[PDB]
Amino acid sequence: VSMTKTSVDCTMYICGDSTECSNLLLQYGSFCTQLNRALTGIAVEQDKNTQEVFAQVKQIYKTPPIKDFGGFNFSQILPDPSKPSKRSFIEDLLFNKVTLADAGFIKQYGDCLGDIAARDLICAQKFNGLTVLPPLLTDEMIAQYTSALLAGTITSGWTFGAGAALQIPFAMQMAYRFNGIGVTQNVLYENQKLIANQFNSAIGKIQDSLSSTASALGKLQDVVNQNAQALNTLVKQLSSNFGAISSVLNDILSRLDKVEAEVQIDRLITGRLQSLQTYVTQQLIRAAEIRASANLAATKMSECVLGQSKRVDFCGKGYHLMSFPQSAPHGVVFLHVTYV
Amino acid sequence: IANQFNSAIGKIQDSLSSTASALGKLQDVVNQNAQALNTLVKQLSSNFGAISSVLNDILSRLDKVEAEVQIDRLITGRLQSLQTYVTQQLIRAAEIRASANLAATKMSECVLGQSKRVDFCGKGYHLMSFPQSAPHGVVFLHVTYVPAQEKNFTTAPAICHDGKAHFPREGVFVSNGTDWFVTQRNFYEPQIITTDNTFVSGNCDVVIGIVNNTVYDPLQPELDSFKEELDKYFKNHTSP
Amino acid sequence: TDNTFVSGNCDVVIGIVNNTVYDPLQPELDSFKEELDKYFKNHTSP
Amino acid sequence: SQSIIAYTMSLGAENSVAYSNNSIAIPTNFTISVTTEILP
Ligand SMILES: *[C@@H]1O[C@H](CO)[C@@H](O[C@@H]2O[C@H](CO)[C@@H](O[C@H]3O[C@H](CO)[C@@H](O)[C@H](O)[C@@H]3O)[C@H](O)[C@H]2NC(C)=O)[C@H](O)[C@H]1NC(C)=O
Ligand SMILES: *[C@@H]1O[C@H](CO)[C@@H](O[C@@H]2O[C@H](CO)[C@@H](O[C@H]3O[C@H](CO)[C@@H](O)[C@H](O)[C@@H]3O)[C@H](O)[C@H]2NC(C)=O)[C@H](O)[C@H]1NC(C)=O
Ligand SMILES: *[C@@H]1O[C@H](CO)[C@@H](O[C@@H]2O[C@H](CO)[C@@H](O[C@H]3O[C@H](CO)[C@@H](O)[C@H](O)[C@@H]3O)[C@H](O)[C@H]2NC(C)=O)[C@H](O)[C@H]1NC(C)=O
Ligand SMILES: *[C@@H]1O[C@H](CO)[C@@H](O[C@@H]2O[C@H](CO)[C@@H](O[C@H]3O[C@H](CO)[C@@H](O)[C@H](O)[C@@H]3O)[C@H](O)[C@H]2NC(C)=O)[C@H](O)[C@H]1NC(C)=O
Ligand SMILES: *[C@@H]1O[C@H](CO)[C@@H](O[C@@H]2O[C@H](CO)[C@@H](O[C@H]3O[C@H](CO)[C@@H](O)[C@H](O)[C@@H]3O)[C@H](O)[C@H]2NC(C)=O)[C@H](O)[C@H]1NC(C)=O
Ligand SMILES: *[C@@H]1O[C@H](CO[C@@H]2O[C@@H](C)[C@@H](O)[C@@H](O)[C@@H]2O)[C@@H](O[C@@H]2O[C@H](CO)[C@@H](O)[C@H](O)[C@H]2NC(C)=O)[C@H](O)[C@H]1NC(C)=O
Ligand SMILES: *[C@@H]1O[C@H](CO)[C@@H](O)[C@H](O)[C@H]1NC(C)=O
Ligand SMILES: *[C@@H]1O[C@H](CO)[C@@H](O)[C@H](O)[C@H]1NC(C)=O
Ligand SMILES: *[C@@H]1O[C@H](CO)[C@@H](O)[C@H](O)[C@H]1NC(C)=O
Ligand SMILES: *[C@@H]1O[C@H](CO)[C@@H](O)[C@H](O)[C@H]1NC(C)=O
């Protein structure tokens, strides 16, 4: 649904506190503002992508105190009241299963210097002018929007999508579903205890699958890994000579006088300018893959969660009954329920 | 329905006349096109380390053997400025294509049709949509049915009348608290529960939450009214 | 006749099969004929 | 008396929908809504 926001300031990346270099970098004109402006365009689009996927209700629905859903057991996908973050059991699995780089939540020297400065990459990225901004919506606010869509789905069916939420008993909602897939509603009511046991058992396999297998969240970990590998590659390009006598502007300025320091520095400015434009082009292209994924995820939220879909194999494999959204780090997970 | 629609179009007419914050998606495209060209024109001012931003000054001051070194800096920085503009435009143009293919999909599914897709053709249940042109874009006026004034009702998944269980053919069973009816799912038009409104399957022991009420047979008053005719004829024909 | 609808003669449909179609109004009218005959049979006596 | 305030954003109006195992809400009336969607 999104990727890590980043701002990279052209000045501390290229010139790294050298005012001497800064007076050369101005000779390349508006390239710095184009980079800053670009990355700001990507960073605002991450909040928009998250807003369009999750904020599909203007009302925060909540579940009734009595869980009488006709024998269906949503307790594993609904919020847990006992937890300090209002995640469901399946969301707390999904949140452990992705290993992040920089949430943006206040990095403040004591964590940055000394013992941790060896193993941690994220502090060194910050020291070189690369910064990761936090999302507009916390993982608590995504968990609340996901709760509203799920509590709306189990209490109200599709009606909370089309207008105000209208209560219906859950076995009568599930009958309107069966009728949608061309199965007559008495096939639910005559088999309801079996249909609930099949659903409750199937939700149990999601618990076990997510607890067991390492490959499940590959579509999300490969976003976090591309963010981290591109940032590491951009930090590593500060090591490059570009044909100058040193990788470090302070060395060149220690050794040389202005007349030829300008020639050694011009090379480092050039290549560094080229290293940022490469990263920002790669990030603009990636951001278009993530926006194409977010617009699909918003379309699936609208058509599989707020509704029921006639579209074959769109809302999982089978004939679609309903779907439950779940939050994940930088993503969304749909539990599609299908009649097979 | 016509007065609600005529008033709703009247609010589009007023809204578009009133508020500046509406066509922001289109003005953003014109602004990004204008900004990118202004930035590419401003890059002609940049020295790139040459003695001047202006190519004729270098050709005024210097002879070819070193004018070419000053020129090669400007060629390099300018050529990098074009590739930056053209990459930005190639990327942006893919966003406008994605927007156009969505607009073509909405033209096909919302204007040339009616969509069962929830929230694809405006907020509500989709009835129809009207396209309107705009500078570099399209506006769709989506027309939607939205359910408005609700009442609560008691309901049941089935009715029991003769140990046989009954389900609606279409719609849902509702009760005002004293009597029972079928209504269509999305609008309250209650009807007497009959063998035309409902279908039978199995007996009342399997359906959780089934309720007792009579189910009317509309053929029975015909055969009853003809039984009264039959008796009055037989009673008369005791006399001849 | 409530599970099915009628259109055309059997000569046009490729692969059509013969079977009875039940009319649920017919046993109502048949039971109404047995009721009519028991009334007329009793009516021989007065 | 105007100033810049800062606040945690409200996601929407909080709403406990009145679910019960035998209760249904049905609309007795409707509004035709016309809504504008804008695309490049
Ligand atoms: C909905 O399904 C839930 C998951 O199966 C179920 O919760 C589970 O219920 C069992 C039986 O009560 C618990 O088993 C444990 O019970 C206590 C817990 O302190 C232990 O002392 C026992 O040794 C035993 O391990 C599960 O732990 C419990 N799982 C969770 C995640 O809570 C619900 O009860 C079902 N809901 C309804 C309404 O039936
Ligand atoms: C539940 O819905 C029922 C059907 O609309 C409704 O019953 C109907 O109530 C009206 C009065 O409000 C009756 O109207 C008759 O009243 C007397 C009867 O002797 C006559 O003088 C009048 O001319 C008129 O015919 C309806 O006859 C009656 N229908 C039936 C089938 O009994 C209930 O009142 C509703 N209950 C609630 C709680 O809203
Ligand atoms: C819905 O209507 C049903 C028909 O009126 C009714 O079923 C009847 O329920 C009673 C009580 O369970 C049974 O009464 C008999 O119970 C035992 C023998 O089974 C005896 O001890 C009693 O003396 C008495 O004979 C009826 O036999 C039963 N009738 C049928 C045809 O099943 C339901 O109880 C009603 N339910 C509700 C909630 O209204
Ligand atoms: C399906 O049921 C049909 C009605 O019972 C049946 O039609 C009958 O078919 C036979 C053979 O074609 C006809 O028999 C007559 O054929 C000629 C005259 O047409 C004579 O030489 C024979 O002696 C005999 O009279 C029936 O007349 C015909 N009935 C009707 C109403 O058309 C189909 O054959 C059955 N098909 C199958 C596969 O079961
Ligand atoms: C269904 O909802 C309709 C609104 O969406 C509602 O229409 C409104 O009806 C009232 C009267 O009940 C009208 O009020 C005006 O009526 C006349 C003038 O026409 C005056 O005497 C009144 O003082 C008042 O000005 C509303 O103008 C009308 N609104 C619209 C948009 O037509 C229906 O009444 C509702 N229908 C049902 C069956 O509940
Ligand atoms: C639909 O019903 C809900 C709740 O159930 C009703 O509660 C009583 C008021 C009574 O009508 C019972 O027979 C029903 O079972 C209604 O929700 C209440 O709304 C009012 C404000 O209008 C609020 O003060 C109460 O706290 C709400 N109660 C609960 C439990 O949430 C709702 O108003 C009914 N809708 C309509 C259109 O009548
Ligand atoms: C509905 O809930 C009540 C308690 O409020 C319970 O007694 C009843 O058995 C339930 N009925 C059904 C059909 O689930
Ligand atoms: C009674 O039967 C006679 C014929 O036998 C007929 O003329 C008369 O109209 C009948 N009246 C009624 C009320 O059926
Ligand atoms: C079906 O195939 C059989 C041969 O297996 C053939 O005799 C028959 O005519 C075919 N029937 C139809 C309705 O096509
Ligand atoms: C026969 O007719 C008489 C009235 O003439 C009636 O009392 C009796 O019950 C009838 N019996 C039958 C079997 O119809």
Author numbering:
A (entry chain A): 729 to 1068
B (entry chain C): 923 to 1162
C (entry chain A): 1117 to 1162
D (entry chain C): 689 to 728
Task: Reproduce, without paraphrasing, sentences from the article in which this PDB structure was first reported.
The fusion reaction is facilitated by the virus-encoded trimeric spike (S) protein after it binds to the host angiotensin converting enzyme 2 (ACE2). S1 contains four domains: NTD (N-terminal domain), RBD (receptor-binding domain), and two CTDs (C-terminal domains), protecting the central helical bundle structure of the prefusion S2. The RBD can adopt either a ‘down’ conformation for a receptor-inaccessible state, or an ‘up’ conformation for a receptor-accessible state; movement of the RBD allows the virus to protect the critical receptor-binding site from host immune responses.
A third variant, Kappa (lineage B.1.617.1), also first reported in India, remains a variant of interest (VOI) but had only a limited surge. 3D classification gave three distinct classes each for both the Delta and Kappa trimers, representing one closed prefusion conformation and two one-RBD-up conformations, respectively. For the Delta and Kappa variants, the FPPR and 630 loop configurations are largely consistent with the distribution in the G614 trimer; all are structured in the RBD-down conformation, whereas only one FPPR and 630-loop pair is ordered in the one-RBD-up conformations. There are only two mutations (E154K and Q218H) in the Kappa NTD. Glu154 forms a salt bridge with Arg102 in the G614 trimer; E154K substitution results in an unfavorable interaction with Arg102, possibly leading to a disordered 173 to 187 loop nearby in the Kappa trimer. Residue 218 is surface-exposed and on the opposite side from the neutralizing epitopes. There are two RBD mutations (L452R and E484Q) in Kappa, which do not alter the overall structure of the domain. The E484Q substitution loses the salt bridge, but hydrogen bonds between Gln484 and ACE2 Lys31 might compensate and thus account for a small increase in ACE2 binding affinity.
